């Protein structure tokens, strides 16, 4: 019934079948889910569904640290229809039938950030007395960062739908149940949907890295 | 349900029946999947499906190392339709029926790189302190390179489709299930789809080669 | 399902019923499958299907070695239709029906190379330190060359088609299966399709020849 | 399914019922199947079908050796239709039905060569160090030559057709099989189709002759 993970998963699929690319849940702090930003701990309830927290990490601007593709377009339509109905030995005619047609008018822009600039970032002196040490140590999420800025300049348009129909009969008792809920969302221009993973380890003074998509969280920081 | 491996496999087929030519999964870092670039380790789950990592290898430009066909066209249509349906002794009418018509408007360009220039490349002094040694030794993918630049200048057009229909009956219970999902992708002009294999072995100081399509990975580097 | 061997086999048939003339698989390095070029080792899986590798052999240009018919036309159509269907004692109605109509607009040009020039080529001093000795000795394909340049100046037009229809029934279970895939390829002007065989033996210093169509590979070089 | 032997056999029939006159398989080196040229060894598989090799024999031009009818026309049509069908005790209805209508627009020209000039040719001093002695002795085909130049100045037009229809039934199993393949070839102007036989014996220094149509190959040269 969520829609906002779905569009990010079309982006994910356009990358790989549930592989490298990562998705976000919502877009108040997703526009601020740019580089140098965190994620929450991961649980496996109702599929892949993790937590999220989006504070900042910039500390110093002594040396050169903040110096600065074409439009990519997705007019796609994805259809998912399915009816599962089963009758029980208690003459219960359990039923369900859903259908959803999603229209995506996804627009994507790109802001290039250098890959060796990541190493330049570890070359930065990590020191900040912002009130995040206590909660960061309490959580120990071993936060990761993003590789490159994947920006959007979109119109306000996504659509969705589902249906459901359930019947039952326990003791000559009729039961019919129907529902048709169609949804759609106004999607705003300049927001962030999909991001990457690059592990960072934080000794209390200076940090170090761990390269490839380490979302299996274990660290003694 | 992937589409981006398919078009690369039309290129592969236009080379050989699943033989020499090699395919890529996606095209954010495929435009940067030019020469001097890596691939991930290979597994055999769900057919031939490997990993990918696309960092760079250029180290020195002391001597002449960076000095610099017509349009090739594919207006093809490939059709794949199939219905597999089987009934079980439990009166289950298991069903499935899919169909996909793919329209490819593939455009290809060529940027010539000399073959003896490969030997000139091994004649280069291999020395770089970029942070890749630790992860490269951890992975030991015995990376390979590409032979010649296979470039594209394309329009934004590929199409695809599938369908599915499944029924069932366990205890006088009706179940009907249908789905029709048609997809299409906007393909951008200047990207890389298919590449080649040429094995390189890396002693810590100076490297050496291994010629023909060694994708069977074993090396003690 | 390959098309590119087929057109070369129309050329082969216009020579002889699967006899002297030889075919190639694809045309990125087929334009560079001119004289002085190699082929891969031969296996007999799925009919006559060999490997291919297309590096160069020119070493010296001390003496006269690089000094330099009308258009031949094929507007043909070849039809191949066939239905094989068999019913099993398990009431399985195994079926298959294919059809393909191929339209060839083949254009051919000729660049004359002297036949005694072959002997002049063995009179050349064979000496080259290009990195091919190691892999050539590892392979031992006892490479052959081509007799005369068979060039093309073509338009972009070949067509093809196939169909298939399979049914089955194991335990009162219906199964119907159909597929219609029509293909066509844009054929480019100046490429090479068919070539010849002339055996060469390579002692490490100077080479020698072996005349007629020795594709049965055995040599102790 | 060959067409190029057929037209030569219309020429042969216009000479005699499979008698004196001889036919060729194809026409890349048939234009160079002029006088002083060879043929391959003969085998009796699938009717009269021999091998072919077309190198040259001219050695000297010291004395007069290279000093130099109307158009003959064949607008004919030959029809060949036939259905052979047989039913087996295994209720197999083996079938076959073919038909072919061939339209020949054959054009023929004549270049006169003197018959006593043949004796003048044996009067020539036979001496040539071209690399053909080794392979000629290895083959021992006791090559023959041609009597008179039978040239053509043709348009590009021959046609052909065949059909086939096969049915079967082994165990109440239906099988129907049909095919309709019509072919046609663009025939080029100045080529050679039919030639003659005159035996030559080659002692290592000087040669000798053997007159009439000795295609029964035996010689100790």
Numbering used by the authors:
A (entry chain K), B (entry chain L), C (entry chain M), D (entry chain N): 2 to 69, 81 to 233
Sentences reproduced from the published study:
Gasdermins (GSDMs) are pore-forming proteins that play critical roles in host defence through pyroptosis. Gasdermin (GSDM) proteins consist of an N-terminal pore-forming domain (GSDM-N), a C-terminal autoinhibitory domain (GSDM-C) and an interdomain linker. Recently, GSDMB was shown to exhibit direct bactericidal activity through its pore-forming activity. Shigella, an intracellular, human-adapted enteropathogen, evades this GSDMB-mediated host defence by secreting IpaH7.8, a virulence effector that triggers ubiquitination-dependent proteasomal degradation of GSDMB4.
Although GSDMB isoforms 1, 4 and 6 formed pores similar in size and shape, those of isoform 1 showed less aggregation than those of isoforms 4 and 6, and isoform 1 pores were seen to be distributed evenly on cryo-EM grids. We thus subjected GSDMB isoform 1 to cryo-EM analysis. The GSDMB pore was found to be 24–26-fold symmetric. 3D refinement of the 24-fold symmetric pore led to a final map at 4.96 Å overall resolution whereas focus refinement improved local resolution of the globular domain to 4.48 Å, allowing us to build an atomic model of the GSDMB pore using the structure of GSDMB in the complex of GSDMB/IpaH7.8 as a starting model. The 24-fold GSDMB pore has an estimated inner diameter of 150 Å, outer diameter of 250 Å and height of 60 Å, very similar to the 27-fold GSDMA3 pore but much smaller than the 31-fold GSDMD pore. Similar to that in GSDMA3 and GSDMD, each GSDMB pore subunit comprises a globular domain (‘palm’) and two inserted β-hairpins (‘fingers’) generated from residues in extension domains 1 and 2 (ED1 and ED2, respectively) in the full-length auto-inhibited GSDMB. GSDMB pore oligomerization is mediated by both the inserted β-strands in the transmembrane region and the cytosolic globular domains. The interaction in the transmembrane region is contributed by residues running along the neighbouring β3 and β8 strands between the subunits. The interaction in the adjacent globular domains contains mostly residues from helix α3 of one subunit interacting with the region around α2 and β11 of its neighbouring subunit; and the α1 helix from one subunit juxtaposing end-on with the α1 helix from the next subunit through hydrogen-bonding and hydrophobic interactions. The cryo-EM structure of the GSDMB pore illustrates a unique interdomain linker-regulated mechanism of pore oligomerization and lipid binding.
